[PDB]
């Protein structure tokens, strides 16, 4: 469980290369390639959860995220082994098509994660969100599989998507991510972040009670934002967009 303090933004791919150089001028570090695959699961509507205390609202149903890393050998087509595995490959990832299709992901079926809507009030300068996390290491039995496990808990699959981007590690534990997101269905693959990169700068705090640390984290994030003034505008997203409860449906992408 962490308090994640975050700021968001977006950029057009035209400046992409330039942006990268500037980051290396500041951090002093080179970018590192990465990828991931997230699957979202929701409580089964076939089961009537009368246990939701309607007269008191002790709790509301929520959605579970399962993440995993996928090797690049599934994301590189027959035209791309010649180039080395570095960040420049992202320049060729502008098409809505991608080597990883629905059948391979179905064949695949980790990190389990749950979150809450950010803290209310208009006196917050950065998006503060609470995250509860655990890890699944292995399994066994006659039906050892992620799908069977989540159906045993009482959850069913809803959708999935694939993230590819680069990471920058700066001082004080600040992490800056440049991402491209591909939604995947049997109908096909569609790039929601079409013609651009999604930028997200964030820090993690282990204990929410410590307030000196939280103040330091906010100071670092606002200093970073004030450093990038004039190039990219980093902003607090909409509090109602980062809500992932089942009752109301929307997805920040």
């Amino acid at each position: 469980m962490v308090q994640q303090l975050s700021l968001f933004g977006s950029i057009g791919d035209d400046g992409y290369d330039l942006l990268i150089s500037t980051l290396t001028t500041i951090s002093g570090n080179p970018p590192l390639l990465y990828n991931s695959l997230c699957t979202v699961w929701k409580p089964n509507p076939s089961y009537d959860v009368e246990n939701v205390n309607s007269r008191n609202q002790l709790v509301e149903p929520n959605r579970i995220k399962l993440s995993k890393e996928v090797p690049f050998s599934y994301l590189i087509d027959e035209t791309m082994m010649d180039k080395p595995l570095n960040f420049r490959i992202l320049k060729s990832f502008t098409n809505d098509k991608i080597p990883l299709n629905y059948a391979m992901t179905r064949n695949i079926l980790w990190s389990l994660q749950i979150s809450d809507i950010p803290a209310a009030g208009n006196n917050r300068s950065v998006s503060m969100q609470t995250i509860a996390e655990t890890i699944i290491l292995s399994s066994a039995g006659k039906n050892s599989s992620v799908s069977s496990l989540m159906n045993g808990l009482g959850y069913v699959f809803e959708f999935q998507y694939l993230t590819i981007g680069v990471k920058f590690f700066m001082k004080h534990g600040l992490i800056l991510e440049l991402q491209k997101i591909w939604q995947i269905e049997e109908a096909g693959n569609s790039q929601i972040t079409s013609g651009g990169f999604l930028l997200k700068a964030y820090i993690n705090v282990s204990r929410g009670t410590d307030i000196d640390r939280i103040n330091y984290t906010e100071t670092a994030l606002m200093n970073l934002k004030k450093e990038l003034q004039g190039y990219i505008e980093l902003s607090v997203p909409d509090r109602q967009s980062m809500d992932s409860r089942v009752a109301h449906g929307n997805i920040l992408i």
Binding site: N29, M170, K171, G173, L174, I175
Partner: protein, 129 residues
């Protein structure tokens, strides 16, 4: 500076510091002196000293590369070098020399107590990775 901080923990094995610019290493048959000096006949072991300097520089470069790799790997990890673990400069050279000395001593002991006593013994030397 790294040599000073590393050798400050090797007093128990016969390594001492003379001043702010000199360190001394003693061996049952040899002596090594490392000095930082201001500018103000080819002997047998001159190449030996040049090689020692070269490998010391190489080990410092290796330390720098390890530091950079650890820094890039993860942001949270505070980069505070541990003298017992990270600083490895005189340890490999001293270990090689003393291991050679002990290998010679055990060779002599085995020859005296086994080879000279029991004829026909066959000895094979190997290194295991």
């Amino acid at each position: 500076y790294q040599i000073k901080k590393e050798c400050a923990l090797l007093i128990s094995y016969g390594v001492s510091i003379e001043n702010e610019n000199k360190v001394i290493i003693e061996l049952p048959n040899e002596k090594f002196e490392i000095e930082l000096l201001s500018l103000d006949l080819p002997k047998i072991n001159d190449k030996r000293a040049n090689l020692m300097l070269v490998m010391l520089r190489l080990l410092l470069v290796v330390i720098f590369k390890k530091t950079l790799r650890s820094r890039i790997s993860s942001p949270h990890g505070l980069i505070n070098l541990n003298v017992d673990d990270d600083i490895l400069i005189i340890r490999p050279i001293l270990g090689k020399v003393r291991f050679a000395n002990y290998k010679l001593l055990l060779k002599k002991i085995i020859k005296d107590y086994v080879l000279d006593i029991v004829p026909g013994s066959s000895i094979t030397e190997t290194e295991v990775e």
